[PDB]
Design a protein around this ligand. Structure first.
Ligand code: MG
Ligand code: MG
Ligand code: MG
Ligand code: MG
Ligand code: MG
Ligand code: MG
Ligand code: MG
Ligand code: MG
Ligand code: MG
Ligand code: MG
Ligand code: MG
Ligand code: MG
Ligand code: MG
Ligand code: MG
Ligand code: MG
Ligand code: MG
Ligand code: MG
Ligand code: MG
Ligand code: MG
Ligand code: MG
Ligand code: MG
Ligand code: MG
Ligand code: MG
Ligand code: MG
Lengths: 204, 53
RNA sequence: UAAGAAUAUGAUGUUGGUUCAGAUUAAGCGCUAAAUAAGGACAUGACACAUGCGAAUCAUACGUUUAUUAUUGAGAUAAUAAAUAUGUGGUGUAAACGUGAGUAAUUUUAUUAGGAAUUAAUGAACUAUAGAAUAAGCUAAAUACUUAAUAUUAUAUAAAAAUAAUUUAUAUAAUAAAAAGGAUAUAUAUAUAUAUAUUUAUCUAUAGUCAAGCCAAUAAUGGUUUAGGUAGUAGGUUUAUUAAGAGUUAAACCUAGCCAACGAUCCAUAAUCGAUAAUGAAAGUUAGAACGAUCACGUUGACUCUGAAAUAUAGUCAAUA
RNA sequence: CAUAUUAUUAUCUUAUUAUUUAUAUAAUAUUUUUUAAUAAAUAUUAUUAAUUUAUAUUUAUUUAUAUCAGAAAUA
């Protein structure tokens, strides 16, 4: 049959209907007693101009097509070159969209700072109103206005710790007394250990 | 798509029909016989031996 | 189936080179040399060459020339004998032989169980079968030359699949392209023709042999103190030419490529290789004289005819002698 | 500074050959229109041979391109 080679497209788009395919073959170098890879670059015909740099393609022998072209792409084994071009094109629009979005967000935050404390707390506490109550409204309550973010973090942290510790305690207890774990396995439906942990974790 | 002036497939392998190869390479005289002359007899013997071989 | 030795040093160990022991030759030279058998023999000036030979053969292609017999009257024609290739013809010298100048890969070599352009209505010269072998003109005549007669591919329809093409079958189109007679016998008839045959030749077609053309992959010396090279250059699209692909060659249009520090380009050097020779334990290294294989050349260069195939040891022109 | 060989060319010259334009009362064959010497039978009618004419195949003439090889220059 025809000579066939597998290679990487290493240069495309610089010649009309021609690409450069780098192929490698196993040779024995007796001077160093080693199996080596011998590399070569082929000028290869590409009807349709479907290949791109970085594709893994199979080239097949043909009639002479020019002074140096004797092979043609017979099949695209792997098409990373086309994928690279696709992502190149897509990223152009993808990036610019959120680039405009976050610039808008930055400008809005700047304006919020532009049109922009202790005085308000003094007025709310002492007056507890002289046309200032509704003016504050436009911006039990002294506390909820003074609500730092750290408190929510601590509540979430205690929730996380409780969940982990409870899951582990329940798992150890069920693995200890192995009758009730069977009870629970037939209630919910060495693999039994993993399935038991699954049921306990969904349990809470 | 293969190159413009090329053939996509390797040429069609043409298997030998030995009966036809014999029929065309060495066919026997379709005329029944002539059986005259001397050199004609020598040539007939040589031809049949060559064909048989 | 792998052996070392002498020489450093005041002495020692080590490094390190030099040299030696072994085999061999396309060998030369010095001294010496009995017979026989076998294998070889200008490596240098691809320098110049006296002289003689190395490719002729065919008379059953056509023409000439004699002598006897016969008939006819200086000759004519038959039969039988001969001589003739200083006349026209055919076949044979693309081989073999020799040589190694060029050639470092633009066509060279080696290898592959490699390819396609799917290499032509090509046989060169033998087989196996078939069918033909017709007229003039020209030469003195002809199997010499002319002219004329007769004898796969492209379309379209389908079929399939080894399928995105090929193959198959059919129908057309044109294919549409030849030739040759001599030597003997007889048999007719009226020396003349003719009809058969036995011979050896001619042409055409199919297949087989033998063979040719082209391409790919890998490998093939030294110098980068030759580092950049390349504009038909690298690629695309057509046309021309070819049996046939390709910037192969010619023409046009484009694109701006291609090679290169894993060494391009350039320069120098060299015919290449083996189941050949040498050597070594072997890997290898060397040779390429002999045996064989391949290439190139036949005083130097280019071109052309013929031919299937030639820049032919041919022919033309030029150079050298 | 002198001698030699090899290569290259926006240069000059150039055998040969192949293509390439254009020209021939240019030739040899076929086609005409005509002019010449023969034939035969009874004014000829046909043959052979020249004139003019238009298609092929050649030669002469040149146009253009390429080309052995020289010359000049450069390496
Ligand atoms: Mg091309
Ligand atoms: Mg000493
Ligand atoms: Mg020695
Ligand atoms: Mg001898
Ligand atoms: Mg010699
Ligand atoms: Mg020699
Ligand atoms: Mg004779
Ligand atoms: Mg003669
Ligand atoms: Mg020869
Ligand atoms: Mg020889
Ligand atoms: Mg040589
Ligand atoms: Mg005749
Ligand atoms: Mg003849
Ligand atoms: Mg070139
Ligand atoms: Mg071309
Ligand atoms: Mg061109
Ligand atoms: Mg180099
Ligand atoms: Mg040499
Ligand atoms: Mg050598
Ligand atoms: Mg030899
Ligand atoms: Mg020799
Ligand atoms: Mg020669
Ligand atoms: Mg000589
Ligand atoms: Mg020569």
């Amino acid at each position: 049959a025809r000579q066939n080679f597998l290679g990487l497209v290493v240069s495309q788009g610089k010649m009309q209907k021609t690409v450069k395919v780098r192929v490698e073959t196993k040779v024995f170098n007796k001077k160093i007693n080693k199996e080596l890879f011998h590399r070569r670059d082929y000028l290869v015909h590409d009807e349709g101009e479907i290949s791109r740099e970085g594709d893994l393609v199979r080239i097949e022998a043909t009639r002479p097509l020019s002074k140096r072209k004797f092979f043609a792409i017979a099949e695209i084994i792997r098409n990373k070159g086309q994928q690279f071009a696709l992502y190149e094109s897509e990223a152009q629009l993808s990036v610019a969209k959120e680039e405009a979005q976050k610039a808008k967000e930055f400008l809005d935050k700047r304006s919020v700072r532009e049109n922009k404390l202790l005085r308000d707390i003094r007025t709310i506490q002492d007056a507890l109103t002289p046309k200032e109550l509704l003016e504050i409204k436009q911006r039990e309550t002294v506390r909820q206005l003074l609500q730092l973010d750290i408190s929510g973090l601590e509540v979430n942290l205690e929730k996380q710790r409780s969940l982990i510790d409870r899951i582990q305690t329940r798992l150890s207890e069920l693995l200890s007394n192995d009758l009730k774990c069977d009870q629970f396995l037939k209630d919910h439906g060495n693999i039994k250990k993993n399935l038991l942990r699954k049921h306990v974790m969904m349990d809470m | 798509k293969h190159p413009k002036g090329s053939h996509r497939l390797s040429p069609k392998v043409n298997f030998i029909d030995v009966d036809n190869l014999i029929a065309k390479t060495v066919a026997e005289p379709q005329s029944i016989k002539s059986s005259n002359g001397s050199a004609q007899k020598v040539r007939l013997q040589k031809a049949e031996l060559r064909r048989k071989f």
